[PDB]
Amino acid sequence: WTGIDLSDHSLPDNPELDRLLSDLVITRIPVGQNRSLTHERRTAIGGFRIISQEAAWHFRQGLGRLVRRPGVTHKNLWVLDARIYGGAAWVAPFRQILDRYKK
Amino acid sequence: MQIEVTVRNITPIFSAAPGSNYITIDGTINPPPGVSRFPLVRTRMMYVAADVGDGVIKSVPLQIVPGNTMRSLLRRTMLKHVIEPALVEKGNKLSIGAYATAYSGNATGNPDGVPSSFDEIATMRAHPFIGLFGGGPRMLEGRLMVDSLYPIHTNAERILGAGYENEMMSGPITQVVWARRMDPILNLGSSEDVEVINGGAVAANGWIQDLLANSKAAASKKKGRGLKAFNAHEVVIPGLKWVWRISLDRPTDAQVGLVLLALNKMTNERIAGGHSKDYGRFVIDGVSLNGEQVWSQSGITGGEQYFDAVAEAIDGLSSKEFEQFAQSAKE
Amino acid sequence: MQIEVTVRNITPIFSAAPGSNYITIDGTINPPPGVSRFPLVRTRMMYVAADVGDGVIKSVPLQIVPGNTMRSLLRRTMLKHVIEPALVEKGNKLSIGAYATAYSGNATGNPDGVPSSFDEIATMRAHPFIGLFGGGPRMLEGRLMVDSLYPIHTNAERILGAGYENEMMSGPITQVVWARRMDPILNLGSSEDVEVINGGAVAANGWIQDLLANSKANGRGLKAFNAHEVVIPGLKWVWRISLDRPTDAQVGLVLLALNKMTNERIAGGHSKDYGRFVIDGVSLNGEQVWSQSGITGGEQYFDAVAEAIDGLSSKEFEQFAQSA
Amino acid sequence: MQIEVTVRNITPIFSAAPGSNYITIDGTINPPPGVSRFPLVRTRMMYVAADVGDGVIKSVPLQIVPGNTMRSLLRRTMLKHVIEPALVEKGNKLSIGAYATAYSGNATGNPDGVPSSFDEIATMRAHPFIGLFGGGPRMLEGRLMVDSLYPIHTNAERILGAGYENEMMSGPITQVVWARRMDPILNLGSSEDVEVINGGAVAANGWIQDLLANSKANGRGLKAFNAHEVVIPGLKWVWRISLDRPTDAQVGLVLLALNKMTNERIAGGHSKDYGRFVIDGVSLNGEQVWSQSGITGGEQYFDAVAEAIDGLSSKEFEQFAQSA
Amino acid sequence: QVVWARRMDPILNLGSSEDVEVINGGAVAANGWIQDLLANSKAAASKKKNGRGLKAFNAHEVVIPGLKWVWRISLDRPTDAQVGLVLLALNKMTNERIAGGHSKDYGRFVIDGVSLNGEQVWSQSGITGGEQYFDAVAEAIDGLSSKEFEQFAQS
Amino acid sequence: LSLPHFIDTLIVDEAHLLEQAFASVYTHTLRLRPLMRTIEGLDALKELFTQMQVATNTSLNVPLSDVPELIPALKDTVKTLGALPTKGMSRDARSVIRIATRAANDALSGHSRLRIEVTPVHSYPMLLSGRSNLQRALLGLWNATGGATLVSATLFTTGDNGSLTRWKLEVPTERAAFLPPV
DNA sequence: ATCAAGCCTTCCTTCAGGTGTTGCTCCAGAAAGGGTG
DNA sequence: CACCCTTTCATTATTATTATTATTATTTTTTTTTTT
């Protein structure tokens, strides 16, 4: 999810032919992915706002694996969690990052 | 000066909410009718836009003390501890209309819409106390601007921007406290207990017969008011952290010094109400002056220019400004 | 004027809370329905901000006796132990309205919404007892402010400012106490026990058969089994009593009742001796003035109340209780 | 008026704490399931704040006999050996309601809504039996405050602030006592034993088959195994009997009930002889009056209860019990 | 939400001899105020079946706090100094209030965002960006003179 | 010694991990199986494991509310591990002894939490004394910093809202500044 | 090293109809005159 | 002179109201790092 370089270093000068990661798929919204003591205390203070916040952070870090440099082309993003396409309100932040892409 | 003060109430807060609220014996607020209900006097509530969940922004009730209330409290502390002491150690004295103007803003109702002189408005807004509380019959704009008391709470997250995410509560924040009000002569047990009552046993038994006759009257009405009144009132729980934002649009240093000297007298003062039940006692645990933390446990230990300014303005305090403030143009 | 009266209850404290709480055979409180449900009368609890995880402050329960009740206990001790002996000692007799206005806040549950005259207000707020306890038909404000009794518990560490950190206790402070009332006519036993009953054994037998009738099916029999949650005994409590610009007689009256306050029950559970307490200390504006024999020091307050109870008369109480 | 009855228990003390508790073969009260738990009814326990280590007070266990239990006990000995002999010697006849209210504080389960008139309160309060234990339909307050039986134990050092500093027990004070049921028809052995059963040996044999059919397979048969936690004998307890402006007759009644206190049992488990005890000392307001031959001292109380026993009619018990 | 406010008489809220020595006339003046209020109350009670006192219980409905408000500022072909002036006002607007209610301290607010032609330009510490607006208004306010105000006024 | 006592300017790249770094250095873990193999080359620590068995959340975020026999076993572990002879102890074994005694002495204070974990390889027993309140340490870091730059790709929740991350690393709000992102 | 491995009914009852004060106030007009610096 | 201040006129005559309605309760299980 977080902290992996999926760009080709065998293609330094030409990002247009970079093809290490053509398809990124998110099977599930990354809820509850951090269980450290400080974050569990912070969850106990703030409530679900901390969990939804950190879930959005992990979601954007998982979405950052696609583009690592300008000049790449035809990068595929998929999300398969059904809460993305339902009418539920608590998954509302994961819309607006999703709203920064089109078609 | 944008003063922010955090006060920890060490007893409950009861600023009563006007209305006709009820509660059942279990503790459900405002029950459907037909069940046995007892009158509940709720604490002061404001609806606040708050973050429940994420972006589901909603009006939740947050229990506060009104800004008008704590404003009156700020006025009374300075008036009781700074103004009137420094007004009676000298020979100055206040008329009853000018005391009413210094305390209630106005000497009476029915204000004169005739305005006031520009030299007058400038001299009252340069005053230490009158520029803060610009009441009078000709209605001044006072430069003291007092916030409602907010609990540092998850429902007040939009009110309090940052720096208060720690020491911040959540969830339900109140408690219903019940009161009995037991008729005293029902507790009477012997001839030794009854000797202070005029007539002793005859008057006690006569009031007993009155109470039973009123009981038959109540049973007739269901199917003159006694001294048994068992009710409820909702308080804000004690130990909560609250924030209070005093605002001063271009103050004289003496005026914010008056606020700071009042804050010094803020301890051993009562916030909201419930004076019989000791509700509203508190301890200040922080004072910030333009965001700069200026409260130690001994006192302020800061704001020194405002302190010497209000010092010089309270030996310069006299009753002439108060009297010409309270003087009505029609009267 | 701030008083910190630390008491220690000797027997368990039971200030009952209104509401229909229920208890199972075990410790469970207010269970899901269908189980064996027995009625529980819980102690009065209050919620406090407390650090449940050293940074996270949450409204935890903590069992108290309310300051409304505490004010009455302090009021009653002064009323029965100082005020009435001074009244009959000089022969002063109150009316029943002034008597109720001494014990409750007024005589009639209807107050007239009429201002009392200033000189009246100055005499009563300079009166020791009536200055402590306001009210009346014109609804005077007192000078006495009684806070609810609070133990030096780790749930009230935000309530307790300083000087009580070591004294604070930790953990649960409650115990459910079970009570039964059987039928003693079921526990009768012998024909020499029924002779005190009129009619004798057959009449006693008559009661038994109604019980068997009441077994097979609003009248209620004697046999009841229930529970009441109490605070545990031997815990250390603190009490705040505040005094708004008080005259010397008023603080002296407060010290008189508290010193003789040991012979008194914190209200709730009289028959089970629940209210018994001993006062560990009395801090008098931060200064400890309690001893084993009572309040040492504070000599001008005891003097001023001594010259106040000489000169207590009925007419102040009568004019207080007289409705406009 | 304060009374402190210091006793020593001859037999062990079992006052059953409610709660279906469980026990293994060696300790482990309320184990996890599947270890073959046995039913256990523990003795009544009061949680009490105690000085556990230096500077730390914790809510610890201490096994007691309830103050409600021994309130009813003191009332029972009072009524069986003083009050009922008085009403037989003058021939006074109590009603069913008068009897039930004198033993249980109420005639029915419904208290009346009206309060009693003050003459009735004064007459009943003056009366010793009525004053000591109130109640009835109009819910009379009583002058007696009966506190629970604490042992003189470390868990009650905070309770015994004055006196009882010596004679302190450090270790636990409970022992688990195991009682089994046995089936006699399994244990009879011989047919000369069954010649007294009608039906002969075949009836006893057929009952053996009923229990065999239960052993293969919810009518409970016989032969159970039980444990009950008991308070160990020989340990000193303290009783506290407080009084609320008592007449001399009420204190004399208490001392009249107290002198014979030994015949009775401060417990449950009647058949196991649990509750036998000897009073080590009795102090009225701290003064020692107890001897081997009952109470030595308090002669004005005994004279007042002597003159109050005379002229004690049934009509007091009748009028108080009668509901409006 | 309805916020209730009560003014009450503070000559009802007195009550010590130390509370009254500050009064011109003192005890008798306060008692004369009391009897005036009593007579006014009896006159009002007989009127129901014009000088009022100080007791006043009233209500005012307020918008709840924490709500996000939008604010559209449209400049019809402005100069650059005009946009700089609006931006400096939006910078320094944090110490001023909305809709009055000064004593209750109503209208306290914080700016969440400022979109200049749709692109967000507001920072927590003012407006970051639009430096040409800030430079134009800086030269303008160096060039600011009251003679332009007088020629706009009189002639 | 390792770094200056006062840092005049501190720039932290990949900022969002920095808080986790503090959560790793203030957590002291006792690993039971490498110690148990090292001593073979005490019975009280076997009883400590048997007592750790009795306490899917297994002793999460609980400082001292469960003490079945945890503190006598901890004190016995401390004394049986600290009194073994250093002479003859291997130069790589004393490191295992010291890290285990440091974990046990971090659990000794009661100022830190406790949490048990298992390895991915097998169900081996893991004892951890971590801390969930890092305000004093991070405040001591930001006191020794004159000015700092918060740098990462992932710092802001919505817009420039860095109040969550300011509440991660306990940055003083008087000193915090949440610059507009790119 | 094992069995017997808790049984039955208790499972609430009154009192608590809250009452008083608050029940709004100002101003939103420009002439034309007379006494000023 | 410009400005700044004090006092005249009218007589109107009922007076509906927005009847909208007002205080909560949802997840979930990683396995890092490169410090003493």
Neighbour count for residue C124 (Cβ, 10 Å): 25
Chains that contact E by 3+ CB pairs under 8 Å?
B, C, F
Contact list in F for residue E120 (CB cut-off 8 A) is 159, 180
Q: DSSP label at E83?
A: H
Structure tokens at A99: 């709203």
Distance E55 CA to G22 C1' (A): 7
Task: Say if the Cβ atoms of C53 and F61 lie within 8 Å.
Answer: yes
Rounded distance, CA F101 to CA F81, Å? 7
Please count the CA atoms within 13 angstroms of the CA of B104 that sit on its side-chain side.
Answer: 26
E touches F, CB cut-off 8 Å, minimum 3 pairs: yes
Please report the DSSP string for D51-79 in residue order.
EEETTEEEEEEEE-B-HHHHHHHHHHHHI
Q: Which residue's C-alpha is at the least distance from the C1' of H31?
A: F120
Q: Flag if C119 and E31 touch (Cβ within 8 Å).
A: yes
Torsion, Cα of A16, A21, A25, A31 (10° steps)? -110
Distance of CA F50 to the CA centre of its chain: 24
SS (H, E, C) chain C: CEEEEEEEECCCECCECCCCEEECCCCCECCCECECCEEEECECEEEEEEECCCCCEEEEEEECECHHHHHHHHHHHHHHHHHHHHHHHCCCCECHHHHHHHHCCCCCCCCCCCCCCHHHHHHHHHCHHHHHCCECCCCECCCEEECCEEECECCCCCCCCCCCCCCCEECCCEEEEEEEECCCCCCCCCCCCCCCECCCHHHHHHHHHHHHHHHHCCCCCCCEEEEEEEECCCCEEEEEEEECCCCHHHHHHHHHHHHCCCCCECCCCCCCCCCEEEEEEEEECCEECEECCEECCCHHHHHHHHHHHCCCCHHHHHHHHCCC
Q: Do D141 and B189 touch (CB under 8 A)?
A: yes
Query: In the 3-class helix/strand/coil scheme, how is A84-98 assigned residue by residue?
Result: CCCCCCCCCHHHHHH
Q: Is D215 left (phi over 0), alpha (psi -120 to 50) or beta?
A: alpha
Q: Is F105 exposed, middle or buried (0-12, 13-18, 19+ CB in 10 A)?
A: middle
Cα–Cα distance for residue pair B210/C108, rounded to 1 Å: 12
Strands B231-236 and B38-41: parallel
Who among residues 21-60 of A has its Cβ near strand H, under 7 Å? 28, 31-36, 43, 47-48, 51
**Residue B9, CA atoms < 13 Å, CB-side half-sphere:** 31
Please give the structure tokens belonging to residue F169. 């690393």
Count Cβ atoms within 10 A of the Cβ of residue C22 and give its class: 0-12 exposed, 13-18 middle, 19 or more buried.
Answer: middle
Burial pattern D178-214, b for ≥16 Cβ within 10 A else e, equals eeeeeeebeeeeeeeebeeeeeeeeebeebeeeeeee
Pairing mode, strands D236-243 and D150-151: antiparallel
Task: Choose among F53, F108, F58: nearest CA to F78.
Answer: F108
Cβ pair A92:B168 closer than 8 A = no
Distance from the F109 Cα atom to the nearest Cα atom in chain B, whole angstroms: 25
Q: In this structure, what token pair is assigned to residue B114?
A: 């005739």
Question: By the 8 A CB rule, do D117 and C242 touch?
Answer: no
E:45-64 Cβ neighbours of strand G under 7 Å = 50, 52, 55-58
Q: Which amino acid is located at E51 in the chain? A: G
Q: CA nearest F162 in E: which residue?
A: E124
Q: Which residue of C80, C146, C161 is in closest CB contact with B283? A: C161
Contact C18, C10 (CB under 8 A): no
Whether D236 contacts D165, CB under 8 Å = no
B225 touches strand G (CB under 7 A): yes
Contact indicator for B9, B281 with CB cutoff of 8 Å: yes
Distance of alpha carbon C226 from alpha carbon C222, whole angstroms: 12
- The strand pairing partners of D231, in sequence order, are D13, D174
The CA-CA-CA angle for residues C253, C254, C255, to 5°, reads: 90
User: Do B147 and E108 touch, CB atoms closer than 8 A?
Assistant: yes
- List of residues 6+ apart from E11 with CB closer than 8 A: B96, B99, B100, C118, E30, E33, E34, E37, E54
Residue nearest to nucleotide G28 (CA to C1'): B113
Closest CA to D237 of D291, D177, D156: D156
Distance CA(B44)–CA(B46), nearest Å, equals 7
Encoding tokens for residue D226? 């039980």
Segments in chain B forming alpha helices (H): 67-78, 84-88, 96-104, 118-125, 201-222, 253-264, 304-315, 319-326
**Residues of C with Cβ-Cβ distance to B25 under 8 angstroms:** 18-20
Q: Is D99 on the interface with C (CB under 8 A)?
A: yes
Distance of CA C269 to the CA centre of its chain: 10
For residue F23, give the nearest of A38, A53, A61 by CB distance: A38
Tell if the CB–CB gap between C245 and E18 is shorter than 8 Å: yes
CA distance F164 to F157: 7
Among candidates C179, C86, C100, which has minimal Cα distance to C136? C100
The whole-angstrom distance between residue D182's C-alpha and the CA centroid of its chain comes to 29
d(CA B97, CA D236): 74
- Conformational region of residue E129, where left means phi above 0, alpha means psi within -120 to 50, and beta covers everything else: left
In this structure, the number of other CB atoms found within 10 A of the CB of residue C322 comes to 16
Interface contact flag, B187 D141, Cβ < 8 Å: yes
Phi/psi at C270 (5° precision): -65, -50
List beta partners, residue E119.
E116
H or E segment at F10? strand F7-12
User: What is the separation of C-alpha F98 from the centre of its chain, rounded to a whole number of angstroms?
Assistant: 15
What b-and-e string marks burial along C168-192, b requiring 16 or more CB atoms within 10 Å of the CB?
Answer: bbeeebbbbbbeebebbbeebeeee
Any idea which nucleotide's C1' is nearest the CA of F128? H31
Q: Are D37 and D31 in contact (CB under 8 A)?
A: yes
Angle at C306 between CA C302 and CA C309, to 5 degrees: 135
* Terminal Cα-to-Cα distance of chain F (whole angstroms): 37
Q: CB–CB of C20 and B10 under 8 A?
A: no
What would you measure as the largest C-alpha separation in chain D, in angstroms?
A: 73
A69 interface with C at CB cutoff 8 Å: no
Q: Which of residues 111-150 of C touch strand G (CB under 7 A)?
A: 111-114, 139
Residue E136 CA, chain-centre distance (Å), reads 31
User: 3-state class of A44 per DSSP?
Assistant: helix
Question: Angle at Cα A60 formed by Cα A55 and Cα A62, nearest 5°?
Answer: 95
Amino acid identity, position A72? V
- Taking the CA of residue F60 and the C1' sugar atom of nucleotide H29, their distance in angstroms comes to 12
SS3 B239: coil
- Residue F128 bridge partners (DSSP): F29, F115
Amino acid at B285: D
Nearest C-alpha neighbor of B136 from the set B157, B109, B112, B105:
B105
The answer to whether the C-beta of C178 is closer than 7 A to strand G is no
For F122, other C-beta atoms within 10 Å of its C-beta total 7
Resolution in A: 3.7
C311-314: list long-range contacts, CB under 8 Å, 24+ apart: C312/C83, C312/C86, C312/C87, C312/C90, C312/C92, C312/C129, C313/C90, C313/C92, C314/C87, C314/C92, C314/C93, C314/C94, C314/C95, C314/C98
What's at C233, amino acid-wise?
P
Please give the structure tokens belonging to residue C7.
């008491």
Using a CB-CB cut-off of 8 Å, the residues of chain A touching C53 are 41, 44
Is B in contact with A (3 or more beta carbon pairs below 8 Å)? yes
Q: For residue D109, give the nearest of C196, C221, C271 by CB distance.
A: C221
Strand H bases near protein CB (under 7 Å) are 18, 22-33, 35-36
Phi, psi of B176 (to 5 degrees): -80, 125
Q: B285 by DSSP, 3-state: which?
A: strand
C52: which chain F residues are within 8 Å (Cβ-Cβ)?
none
Question: CA–CA separation, B182 vs F119, rounded Å?
Answer: 66
Q: What is each CA distance from F31 to F45, F95, F97, in whole angstroms?
A: 11, 12, 10
Distance, CA of D42 to CA of D230 (rounded, Å): 7
Other Cβ atoms less than 10 A from the Cβ of E32: the count is 14
D321 contacts: CB under 8 Å, gap ≥ 6: D95, D97, D98, D100, D101, D102, D107, D136, D137
Interface test with B, best of C77, C104, C323 (most B CBs within 10 A): C104
Pairing of strands C224-231, C38-41: parallel
B28 Cα to chain C: minimum distance (Å): 10
CA atom of E44 to C1′ atom of G3, Å: 92
Burial of residue B312 (number of CB atoms within 10 Å: 0-12, 13-18, 19+) = middle
Nearest CA in chain C to F135: C55
Both tokens assigned to C162: 């300083």
Q: Does B176 touch chain D (CB under 8 A)?
A: no
Return d(Cα B56, Cα A89) in angstroms, integer.
Answer: 7
Residue B194, chain D, CB below 8 Å: the answer is yes
Whether F157 and A56 lie within 8 Å, measured CB to CB = yes
Q: CB distance from C139 to chain E under 8 Å?
A: no
Contact C114 E41 (CB under 8 A): yes
Pick out the nucleotide with least CA–C1' distance to B171: H24
Q: Is A65 exposed, middle or buried (0-12, 13-18, 19+ CB in 10 A)?
A: middle
- Whether the CB-CB separation of D312 and D86 falls below 8 Å is answered with yes
User: Which residues partner with F163 through β-bridges?
Assistant: none
Between the alpha carbon of residue B240 and those of residues C51, C76, D64, E96, the distances in Å are 11, 32, 39, 30
3-state DSSP assignment of residue D109: coil
Spacing of B116 CA from H5 C1' in Å: 14
Question: How close does chain B come to F105, measured CA to CA in Å?
Answer: 29
CA gap C274, F47 in Å, rounded: 45
| Structure tokens that stand for E141 in this block | 């306010």
Cα–Cα dist E3/C141, whole Å = 26
Interchain contact A37–C (C-beta under 8 A) = no
In three-state secondary structure terms, F66 is coil
Q: Closest chain E residue to B147 measured between Cα atoms?
A: E105
Q: Least CA distance to E55: which residue of chain C?
A: C115
Q: What residue in F sits closest to C54 (Cα-Cα)?
A: F133
In the 8-state DSSP scheme, what is residue D250?
H
C207 contacts D94 by C-beta, under 8 angstroms? no
